[PDB]
Amino acid sequence: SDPIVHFNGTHEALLNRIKEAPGLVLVDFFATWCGPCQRLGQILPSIAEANKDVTFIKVDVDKNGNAADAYGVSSIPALFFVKKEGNEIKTLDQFVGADVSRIKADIEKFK
């Protein structure tokens, strides 16, 4: 089955979904017309399939503008490695760009 979470909802809905995850979360804010986003989107499913302990959440900024804007996203693709910490979300790493190698390195380092 498709392991990628294709998120649709409000900023609060996004925060709650992140807090539902059992472990590490990667949130990818993207647009469909963005080249780096497209190239990252082609390889994310493979990374997700190999790392079922990590929740991969994709947030299309055009359909979830309020969520993205409220999360503080400007440039894309905007990546955030986060984890639930009590009733709060801890951010472990964040960056803009299709840095596949950093994505992989962050996954390996965090677990």
The reported resolution of this PDB entry, expressed in Å, is 1.9
Q: Based on the residue annotation, tell me whether 4 is a catalytic residue of this protein.
A: no
DSSP class of residue 99 equals: -
Q: Which of 5, 18, 27, 37 is catalytic?
A: 37
**Cα dist from 58 to 62, 86, 100, whole Å:** 12, 23, 15
Q: Which of 4, 31, 34, 89 is catalytic?
A: 34
Q: Does domain 1-111 have CATH number 3.40.50.300?
A: no
Method by which the coordinates were obtained: X-ray
Nearest Cα to Cα of residue 88 among 18, 13, 27? 18
- List b or e across 35-58, with b for residues whose CB sees 16 or more CB atoms inside 10 angstroms: ebbeebbeebeebbeebeebbbbb
Q: Based on the residue annotation, tell me whether 93 is a catalytic residue of this protein.
A: no
Q: Report the C-alpha gap between 29 and 37 in whole angstroms.
A: 9
